[PDB]
C-alpha cells in the first residue's frame, strides 16, 4: 500500500506515534517519506547483508526475523514480512521500541540527514487530524 501523506499521519496518530518519546507527528511522517515514499512494501538490502522493511525501513540486523541475516536479533519478535503489511500496526509497535533504544530518531539515518532540524510540521500541515 502507498499511503497518502495525510492518510499516513492519521494512521500513525491512531497508533500512538504523535509525540511518542517527544517526537511530533511530522517527524514520523518525514521519516517515512524518505525511508519508503510511504510504500508499505519497500525493501532495501544493506551492505552488511541485513534488509530494511516497510514504511519505516526497519532493519533485520536487530529488529525482525527474515531468516537470512547472520548473527542477527529479532527484538520486535516479528517476521520482517509483517512490516510490509497494508496495516501499519507492526511497523508502529516496532518503531516505538527502536526510538526508545537510547538514540531517539537518530536510529533512522535518513531522519538525521533529511528531517532533523527542518520544518517537519510541513509534513502534517493541512491534514485533518
Ligand atoms: Cl509536527
Ligand atoms: Cl530523544
Swiss-Prot record:
Keyword terms, alphabetized: Allergen, Antimicrobial, Bacteriolytic enzyme, Disulfide bond, Glycosidase, Hydrolase, Secreted, Signal
Keyword DNA repair: no
Compartments it resides in: Secreted
Gene assigned in the entry: LYZ
UniProt xrefs under SUPFAM superfamilies: Lysozyme-like
An example Gene Ontology biological process: cell wall macromolecule catabolic process
Entry-linked InterPro entries: Glyco_hydro_22, Glyco_hydro_22_CS, Glyco_hydro_22_lys, Lysozyme-like_dom_sf
SMART domains: LYZ1
Tissue: In the egg white and polymorphonuclear leukocytes.
Name of protein: Lysozyme C
EC code: 3.2.1.17
GO molecular function: beta-N-acetylglucosaminidase activity; identical protein binding; lysozyme activity
Pfam hit, one: Lys
Chief location of this protein within or outside the cell: secreted
Family of the protein in this entry: Belongs to the glycosyl hydrolase 22 family.
Cystine crosslinks: 6-127, 30-115, 64-80, 76-94
